Amino acid sequence: TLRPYLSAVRATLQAALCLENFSSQVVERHNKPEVEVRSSKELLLQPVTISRNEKEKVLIEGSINSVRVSIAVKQADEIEKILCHKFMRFMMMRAENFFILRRKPVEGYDISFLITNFHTEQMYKHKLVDFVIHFMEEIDKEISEMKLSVNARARIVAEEFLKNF
Amino acid sequence: GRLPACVVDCGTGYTKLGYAGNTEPQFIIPSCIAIKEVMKGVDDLDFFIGDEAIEKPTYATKWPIRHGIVEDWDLMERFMEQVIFKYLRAEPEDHYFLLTEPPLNTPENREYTAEIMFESFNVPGLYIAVQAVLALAASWTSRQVGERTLTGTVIDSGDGVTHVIPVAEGYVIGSCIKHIPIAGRDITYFIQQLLRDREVGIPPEQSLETAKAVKERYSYVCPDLVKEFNKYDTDGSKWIKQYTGINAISKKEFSIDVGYERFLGPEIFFHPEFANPDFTQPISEVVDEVIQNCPIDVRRPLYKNIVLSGGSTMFRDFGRRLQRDLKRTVDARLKLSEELSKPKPIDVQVITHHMQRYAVWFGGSMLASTPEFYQVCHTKKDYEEIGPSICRHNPV
Amino acid sequence: AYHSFLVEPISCHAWNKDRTQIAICPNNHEVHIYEKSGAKWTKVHELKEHNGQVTGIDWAPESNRIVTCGTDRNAYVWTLKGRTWKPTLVILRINRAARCVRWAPNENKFAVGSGSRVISICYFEQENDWWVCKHIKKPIRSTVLSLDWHPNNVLLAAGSCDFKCRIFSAYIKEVEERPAPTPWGSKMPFGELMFESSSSCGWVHGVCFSASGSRVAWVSHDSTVCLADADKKMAVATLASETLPLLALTFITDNSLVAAGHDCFPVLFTYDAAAGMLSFGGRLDVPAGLDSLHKNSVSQISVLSGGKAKCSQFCTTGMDGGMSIWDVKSLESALKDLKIK
Amino acid sequence: RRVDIDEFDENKAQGVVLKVLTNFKSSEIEQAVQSLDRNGVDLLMKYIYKGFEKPTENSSAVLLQWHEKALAVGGLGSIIRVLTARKTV
Amino acid sequence: SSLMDPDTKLIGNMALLPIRSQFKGPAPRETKDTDIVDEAIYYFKANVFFKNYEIKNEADRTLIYITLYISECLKKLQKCNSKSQGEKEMYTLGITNFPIPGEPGFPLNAIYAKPANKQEDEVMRAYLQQLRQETGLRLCEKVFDPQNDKPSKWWTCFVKRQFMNKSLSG
Amino acid sequence: VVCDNGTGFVKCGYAGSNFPEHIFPAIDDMKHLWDYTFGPIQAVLTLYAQGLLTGVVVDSGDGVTHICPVYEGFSLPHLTRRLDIAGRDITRYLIKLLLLRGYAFNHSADFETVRMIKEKLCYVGYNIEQEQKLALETTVLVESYTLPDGRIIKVGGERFEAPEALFQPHLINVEGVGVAELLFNTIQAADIDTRSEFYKHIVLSGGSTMYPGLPSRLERELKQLYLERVLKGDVEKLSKFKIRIEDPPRRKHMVFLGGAVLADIMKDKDNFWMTRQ
Amino acid sequence: MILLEVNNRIIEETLALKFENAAAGNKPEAVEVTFADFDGVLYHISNPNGDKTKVMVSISLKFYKELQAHGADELLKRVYGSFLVNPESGYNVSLLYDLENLPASKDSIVHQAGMLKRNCFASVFEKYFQFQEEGKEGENRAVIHYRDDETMYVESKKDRVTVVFSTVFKDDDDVVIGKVFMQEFKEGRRASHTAPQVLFSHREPPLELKDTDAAVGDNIGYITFVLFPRHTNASARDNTINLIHTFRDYLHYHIKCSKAYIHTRMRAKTSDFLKVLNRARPDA
Ligand SMILES: Nc1ncnc2c1ncn2[C@@H]1O[C@H](COP(=O)(O)OP(=O)(O)OP(=O)(O)O)[C@@H](O)[C@H]1O
């Protein structure tokens, strides 16, 4: 059931993202996203969650012009935890050129997607949904290969040293 | 504070390694890497830098340190691996490193470099200074100065693109730098073609190294060309020499003449029109144009100290003629002044010393053997507490 | 039929009275008037005055005027002086971005809705040569989103973010004389609240009166659409959408409606007044990587052909430079599930 | 710089649903979801966003199948009525 | 200045330069034994690698004419195997004519003042004959070694080096 | 006819116009200004431009900042104070921000290029901590720019920090105020008669008011200070309190413009000036 | 590389230059090169007291108090001999080469100036290879601190020798990766059954040395080496001590290398997502 889990997410992100331009109700002449500053209560939508198990959960927090989507990542053991934590902290250094994310995730969550109105304009917003799915598609497998990378390359390193005695 | 600190100084063509306190580096290795034609384990360790990289015909020789910037990180990263555990043998958790970088690098490219040292090498310190400042820090020991000053002019003479920088209070000025595509490499091509046309019997497939050493062992700045050709014709003795090339293929010795490519070799800095019609502008005033862009207050300090850098200023009295070449420049522009107009004439001095072969690295042993360097390093906890924005900038 | 202009999102579209020229701003300081030259489009005018973005425009079809509203709290009236259009300084006594604007059919006053929970109404005085702003403050509590006029030049619809479609009374008494009575109520002064909607669900994105102005309808953010009557005494009827979020909607007779949204293909509507039923039609259409010709959502619907009553041609402009022009009689043929009353 | 005055201005049952759905098997979703009216789906729509917010041992697995049949019936606008309800249950 | 004085006058694109020649007598005449074409060989190798020589004078019009003349002569003494074989190929090129000012087929016509009459062009041909005469016998002792039939390699290394990238004949 | 000769920017023009019809600065040294000029208080002019009598002026331009209480006809001179924070010192602070971001700039040569960035990218924040949850947390503030030598830098968290650190007496080395503080000091130094008159009669004038949201911070900080020192903690008595702060659209070209409404011109003006009486 | 350099490439380039100056008869030069290596080892090569023909190697440590009581001076005074002189001020051992007394084939002492830290760890091993091969048990175990927190524990047994590193994994991420290297080190005899077998535990010292003050901590694992006489016989002392005296530094290598392998794999992948994000961005 790994496939239909992404489907309902794909079935929710499309519903999530139908936005517009909207200036600040609070401040003169500004345009700041609503799901971050949270100063106008009535605009913020109801935060929803979709999960497959105790762990694989995705939060969506909608507003009038921005949606903060966050993702829990499957962390099977401690050796993948540093594989989880670096792979995040690699890309979170690089959210300036790769620039639709947050720098620091939600407390309890692993990475936070922040799509404004402008990012729905200069990009095809029926495919930014598909990119968010694509990011969850292969980091299941991306970390899965690097475990098999390390458990192979130690075996190359060790067998050389021990036969040399 | 008892075991000293590495100063890895990755130049354009030649990497300059070495530990602190040292007059000269323990390596002068060509900045190049051989890599196999992704690769895993034993496939992903076969890394060979420098001298074996030029040697090995099996693997290709990438030069990722190109124009001073990094072409690609994942091959730069392997070069920073085996610059430590194979040639420096330093303790990777116990030295406050000092990487170095050419001017106008983006402050993304700092946090690409500083990331890997704090996340694949666990270094206890790091301080990525610019090449220009620690260049002129080397000339503080010179007898041409008596007082310390960190404001003046450096003349980088690199291998990909030479630069010119005015510097002020320990900070480069990103407005006034100028690419000039003369280099160390441009002198190689045409004097190789100058011995294609006069010497007979040199195999073409190694003639660049052949052209290299005669530039190394026999070049000199000629002071003035029009008297110079007669001094070969009047005197065939004390100007004509003979170079003894070793045939790397056919295993022999071949003698070649040391003739006219001596004096024109360094002279193309004084006129670029000898080898390129892309620049009609000599070096005698293009540094003065870079001078004439900075504000009015900083120019009068900027005349007193022009500093030579890089290996491509290892030619006999290169500073002497170019001193006169700037005195012809600046006095003619104030010759406009007194006519129309009163301001005092200003002295201009260039700087030379012994280690100007590699005076970029020699600044690294004036810093890492001082306690103030231990004050200003990024510690490892500073990356872990606050994030890469502390290491995206540089301290003083 | 589909022309496309640009990559930028255009704010809103309007036409001349013959419905030939069009005027839009594609996400900039500059609203551009375009015009057919056969099947060829001509950038006939450019407007460079607003120091902020602009958000809503209406061409005055009869006085040849152009109203603006934007985000630098400034609204400018553009009237044709020969070839070069000239602005007009209009102070609304509000401080932030406006949202939408449209002329009353007398062309004597225009309604601006904005973020300071008030609606500024400028009607033109003649001695000072001035558009005096007068305000409808109570009980609007949120940012006003969409507006619509009754054809009597007296009433004024209002839709904001407090979910409550509060239809009003804004009879200006000094440039207009005492109008006829209205099936809402009797006394109509300025600022007179008349009826607050029963909608506590979904934002109020688009409102419109009918050609009578006795009927009024609105679509909501929660995929619903609701209509009420002045003749049937404020009776709000309820209908939920089973499609996608939606913005714009318009009448075509007095009880027949057409609305499109974030799919940019329509799906008609008719108000069954006999059974009291808002019943959603059926796309009435017939079928990058997209079935609809235009890429982004709708931003506006408006009728090319002779008012909202006739009612045949209508175009769809959205958050991209394309226009899909749609004729009703062009759509009458191939559809097998349409409903028209 | 130390106080919030953005608010002080002069303007502007649960455990029953999870118990039945997890006891309802996966094969009878089509007979359970489609038996409700236009308002019963949106009533069921807020139900599915309860156990997905508060998971248990056997909660989040089968309710994705419960989200599946209600997706096609509810369409795409049925989800908004979770988002936009400023007073909800 | 060094190649120009108001005592001599501008006839043609250049001023008629005071020669010292193979013969003595009535000619444009100078005091010192050093000639312009001596100087056109003396400061030759300091001028051979430029791209755009300055104009301080009209004697440069002569001076780069000799340069393109030597640019022809370097193509000839690539193939020479004795001093007599070199001179007869220089007597060959010293007689054979190429176009000279404002003339099609001759490059750089935009620089030179063109004499329009029939008179001054012929006198220029009578002077450019002397340019083709007086240069070649001074190239005998200066290209070849004092041990005869030994072409010096210090004139070989200009065979690809030109004033600019033009072909002289085509 | 009106003449307008300034300190850091000098104007000229005719009567009944829309703008200063030419602009050029003043290069003893003001006595030579008459040569290129004839060839083609401010606050009373500023108030009557908006068309009022007694109010509060936020005069924030280039060289120095004034705050002016001014009555119907005359000013309030002893009430009208003058600060010493300028507009340039914002830019001088803004370099050091971007320098610690990592971009090389000199304070002398690179001066005007940063001044372009300030007038395009930089603004003010209503609060600091919710604002600083955008630099450390989110992408949004990061916006591109292009240098005139062709380089493209990105500025994120150093946009909103134009005003803040030299309001503190450390970075300015001067014990002083914020911005609403000396504002609030002056009204409570003023009368009680026209006190609530003042809090709906605040005008902003100058190019150093072009920061968006600056009338959203002055409204927020005065709700501290009137709660602090005057009303001393009460809830609903603060809800009565009138706050209206004004800023004209054409205010940057208004000082010469507003005088045209007062300027009841004559047949003669030469007959009083002492070199031409 | 895959095996480290028991060679010392910071001298083997240096003095190999130096004798060829005298072999060409050139005048020697003022050389003073001061530099380091693994494990806190400091070097100093200089002309001693002002003559350019005299070339002095000089090494400082902190172990010579703990090491000299384990038979140090029998080894290197035998091997180096008249090369070895009085220790220089501030230095434990000080060798000396004079370039007026060059040997015949210089590629020996150039090579045998590169074992200069290797010859100090050998003598404590050579002392305790005697005690195994002659059965003389009842011996105190050598407790040798080779850093501030890095202690060496040897053990002579009946038919074997075991030896123990007291490693400290100073960061937090290295520990989790570092435990995976001892897995295949525990699985070393899947095809290499002639290999010296290794035990490992983390944070818990071995019970054989539980009587000591052996610490307990998150940074610390304990690594053994079962040494049969088949690898410590008289034929292969010198092979075995070359491998074993760098194994702490060897394991610092492939931890950092396997970190480096991630940042080349992952930097490729951040270009892949940034590719796909530019495709939904329009061609226009
Ligand atoms: N005595 C010499 N004679 C001739 N050429 C020399 C001499 N010394 C050095 N060079 C030349 O100088 C070049 C080295 O320049 P440089 O030291 O600037 O390289 P780099 O350190 O890699 O560059 P950079 O420091 O600018 O990044 C070499 O290519 C060499 O050919």
Ligand SMILES: Nc1ncnc2c1ncn2[C@@H]1O[C@H](COP(=O)(O)OP(=O)(O)OP(=O)(O)O)[C@@H](O)[C@H]1O
């Ligand atoms: N659009 C803008 N955004 C931000 N700052 C601006 C803008 N326009 C001008 N400024 C700032 O305003 C200052 C000048 O404004 P102003 O014209 O009010 O002062 P000034 O009249 O020149 O000074 P003085 O009164 O001394 O003549 C400049 O220093 C500039 O930094």
